[PDB]
Every structure is written in C-alpha cells, then in structure tokens.
Ligand binder design. Sequence first.
Ligand SMILES: *[C@@H]1O[C@H](CO)[C@@H](O[C@@H]2O[C@H](CO)[C@@H](O[C@@H]3O[C@H](CO)[C@@H](O)[C@H](O[C@H]4O[C@H](CO)[C@@H](O)[C@H](O)[C@@H]4O[C@H]4O[C@H](CO)[C@@H](O)[C@H](O)[C@@H]4O[C@H]4O[C@H](CO)[C@@H](O)[C@H](O)[C@@H]4O)[C@@H]3O)[C@H](O)[C@H]2NC(C)=O)[C@H](O)[C@H]1NC(C)=O
Ligand SMILES: CC(=O)N[C@H]1[C@H]([C@H](O)[C@H](O)CO)O[C@H](S(=O)(=O)O)C[C@@H]1N
Ligand SMILES: *[C@@H]1O[C@H](CO)[C@@H](O)[C@H](O)[C@H]1NC(C)=O
Ligand SMILES: [Ca+2]
Ligand code: NI
Length: 387
Amino acid sequence: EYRNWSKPQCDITGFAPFSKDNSIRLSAGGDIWVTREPYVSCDPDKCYQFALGQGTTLNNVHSNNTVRDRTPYRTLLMNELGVPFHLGTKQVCIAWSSSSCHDGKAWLHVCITGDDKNATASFIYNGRLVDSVVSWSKEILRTQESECVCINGTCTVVMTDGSASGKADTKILFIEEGKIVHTSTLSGSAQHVEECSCYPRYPGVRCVCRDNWKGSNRPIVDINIKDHSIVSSYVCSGLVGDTPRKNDSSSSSHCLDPNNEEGGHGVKGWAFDDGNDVWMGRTISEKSRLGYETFKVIEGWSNPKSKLQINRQVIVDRGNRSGYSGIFSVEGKSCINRCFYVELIRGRKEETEVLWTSNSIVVFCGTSGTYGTGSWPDGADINLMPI
Ligand SMILES: *[C@@H]1O[C@H](CO)[C@@H](O[C@@H]2O[C@H](CO)[C@@H](O[C@@H]3O[C@H](CO)[C@@H](O)[C@H](O[C@H]4O[C@H](CO)[C@@H](O)[C@H](O)[C@@H]4O[C@H]4O[C@H](CO)[C@@H](O)[C@H](O)[C@@H]4O[C@H]4O[C@H](CO)[C@@H](O)[C@H](O)[C@@H]4O)[C@@H]3O)[C@H](O)[C@H]2NC(C)=O)[C@H](O)[C@H]1NC(C)=O
Ligand SMILES: CC(=O)N[C@H]1[C@H]([C@H](O)[C@H](O)CO)O[C@H](S(=O)(=O)O)C[C@@H]1N
Ligand SMILES: *[C@@H]1O[C@H](CO)[C@@H](O)[C@H](O)[C@H]1NC(C)=O
Ligand SMILES: [Ca+2]
Ligand code: NI
C-alpha cells in the first residue's frame, strides 16, 4: 500500500489546464482566507490544495499588513483541489513554513512555527504528532513549501536553517510514519538551497530548488532513499529559471556552480529532466514576479551552453502577477506524471490599492496529447476590492 512510484515518467509534450480557484475574486463577495506559499499534493485518489493561512479572512480588519511572513497565527490550510479556502477549511497544523506528502497510507505534514531564532518543526503523520526538531542554526528554520516525496514508506523533506544571503545549513530528513529516522547534511555542489520542488525519480527523489545567495540557475538536490546519500549541482540550462536573473541574450549557467548573475534573492520554482532535455517554468519578467511561462530546453539538463527552447507555453501573461510555483507528481495507470501550480500574488507591497497580501492559484498538468494557448491570471479587480 505504500507508494513506490516505480513507473517511468510520462511522455510530456507540454501541459494542459488542470485547476484554478479564483480565490481573490471570490474574496470580494465571501469570507475567504488570506494565504501565501500555496502548493498541491495528491493522495492516491485525489489532489488537495494547501496554503499558509494568515489567521484571517481577506474582508476582515486582520488582513492589514499580511505581507508579513512569520506570525504565530499562520497555519497550514488543506482542501480538495478546486475547493477555495472558505471558513470550513481545515487548519492541519501551526506553520509559517511547511511541506506535506502522502506515503500511500496516510498524510505527513512538516510544520514550522515559533521564534525566528528558535523555531520548531512538528512532524504530524496519520493525524497525530510523531516527532519534532528544533532549529539547528537559530536563523529561521524553513522548508520546501511544496510536497515532500515518499518511497516504500520513507518520506524525504529538505530543510534549511541559517543565512538567506550566505552559506546556510541545509539538511535532508528521512521520515517513516512521522518519525525522523535519519538526517543527512547537504553535500555536493549546490551552494545555497531553499524551497525545494522535489519529485519521485525511482529509485530516488530529485529536487530543483532556489539559490537565494549567488545563483539565478536553480540548484538540484538528488536524494538516495536507500543509503541516504546526497549529491547536488545546478540545472545546466543557459536559460535559467530563477527571478531575478539576466535576460535571455546575456544570461549563462553552470552545471556545478552558481552563475553569480543576479544571484541574490530568488523565487520558488521547479524543473524536471527528460533525458538530456529539461522542462522548466519561470516568471516571464526576469526582474519581477510578472507572468509565467513553461518550455523545454533541448539538452538543457546536461549542456550549460544550450539556450535552445521549444514548446513554450504562456501560463500567465506578462501583464499579470505570478509568484511561487512548484511541482507535484501524479501516478497514472502506466507512468508518473508531472504537474505544477502557480501562485498568483495580489496586494502589498507591489500593489498599494489594498492593505493585504494574498494569492489565488492556477494548476496545469503534463500531457502526452495536444493543447492550445491562453492566459489564466488572478482576475481580481484590485481597485474594487475591500481594502
Ligand atoms: C530554544 O528553545 C529551547 C526549548 O524551549 C530552550 O531551552 C530551554 O530553556 C529553558 C529556559 O532556560 C529551560 O528551562 C529551564 O530549566 C532550568 C534547569 O536547567 C530551570 O531552572 C528553569 O526554571 C527557572 O527559570 C525559569 C525561567 O526560564 C523560571 O520561570 C522558573 O521559575 C525557574 O526560576 C526559578 O528557579 C530558579 C532556581 O534556580 C531561580 O533562579 C529563579 O529565581 C526562580 O526562582 C523562583 O522560583 C523558585 C522555585 O523554582 C523558588 O525557589 C524561588 O524562591 C523563586 O520563587 C527553566 O525551567 C529548558 O530546560 C530548556 N529546554 C531544553 C530542552 O534544553 C532554549 O533556551 C531556546 N534557545 C534560544 C536561543 O532561544
Ligand atoms: C520562512 C520564510 O520566511 N520564508 C519566506 C522567504 C525567505 O525570506 C527567503 O526564502 C530567504 O530565506 O521569502 C519569501 S519571498 O516571497 O519574500 O521571496 C517569502 C517566504 N515566506
Ligand atoms: C495597518 O497597519 C499599520 C501598521 O502596521 C497602521 O499604521 C495602519 O493604521 C493600519 N491600517 C488600518 C486600516 O488599520
Ligand atoms: Ca537567486
Ligand atoms: Ni562561473
């Protein structure tokens, strides 16, 4: 009954529309949670949307100044995918940073809350607290903000503690039925790792992450489930996936080093390999969280000089706000499929018409079929929203 994900990756020609929740538009005529850092994860039957609530609904005095990242009121929300975060939504744990995943039998939730310099991560499995760990470097323990990955009952989750603009202490935790059974330190060539988007790649787990220090190319962390070994590098592709970054004409990348091109800061993102090619998404603006696009870089997984992209799709047009994005994987009859969500951020600080900060989501899944074009932005009229 445990998931093992021992099927080949599906053939992927692109991505087709899967879900959208319209939560900000709904917020203007209904009681909807303020959120950020959303993600998607599916049990063997159905998918769920998650997000970090801000302990308030949008049309509510407490939505003021929800641009703040960490408060004791943030909790992890969980609904079936496509059900918006209404007041019946379950808060599954206290968290201003989270990861969740289903091992085939039950849900694991990794939830981080508490003091910036002395946070706690609770591990909740099958509806009960099984373990916890304290911040090891006293500098904002934080994790993936997207699904973890379980193989044969062993789940893995990437966690970082320490500087956001320098060497930090990243660890890969191995969790069985909610108990931390082993911990490995980040090893290899990735020099800064945050907010990993991880996927099953039998027999292991592979992650594409955020370098917040010197890289606008994304780190890769590869996790061996059996022997707990870790290796790490960077997505080779000369079309890089972080924001900020240089323009397509002047950017470059390395397979084993951060490129040092607009490296500081970043945004959660994702990519995955298909042979020597790489599928990746990124904002369309190279400086800001405007627009979202996907495409395949031919030999982009192994050749750091390639900028040869194909199969581009606009998900969110360049005139509209995007935000975080991350991967999740869905088991099919004969192959493992790859999907992604996009966070559509509205409000402060970039938009000052309102006092709050929140998001909606849109979701696409890989397809072996055909597909057209479009743009699926947030759609809320900020000028007519409650303040
Ligand atoms: C990160 O988080 C971790 C985990 O939360 C932190 O580690 C924890 O830190 C706790 C605080 O130091 C520690 O609890 C303490 O344990 C010591 C034993 O080593 C114990 O003595 C402490 O209790 C005294 O101090 C607390 C304040 O912290 C008082 O509220 C309490 O009343 C106790 O003070 C009383 O007794 C002392 C006797 O020695 C007197 O000095 C003091 O004046 C006071 O006396 C009054 O009451 C007396 C009766 O007890 C009475 O005789 C007298 O007349 C007075 O009326 C406290 O329990 C945890 O053990 C520790 N946890 C772990 C797992 O290590 C860590 O600090 C955090 N780190 C950062 C960087 O934030
Ligand atoms: C745990 C935590 O506070 N995470 C926040 C990160 C973090 O500050 C950076 O990754 C640097 O460590 O920043 C993002 S962002 O949207 O501001 O880019 C917002 C997130 N809530
Ligand atoms: C929102 O918060 C700021 C300070 O955090 C405060 O000065 C301002 O008055 C608040 N606005 C409202 C409408 O309460
Ligand atoms: Ca960066
Ligand atoms: Ni270099």
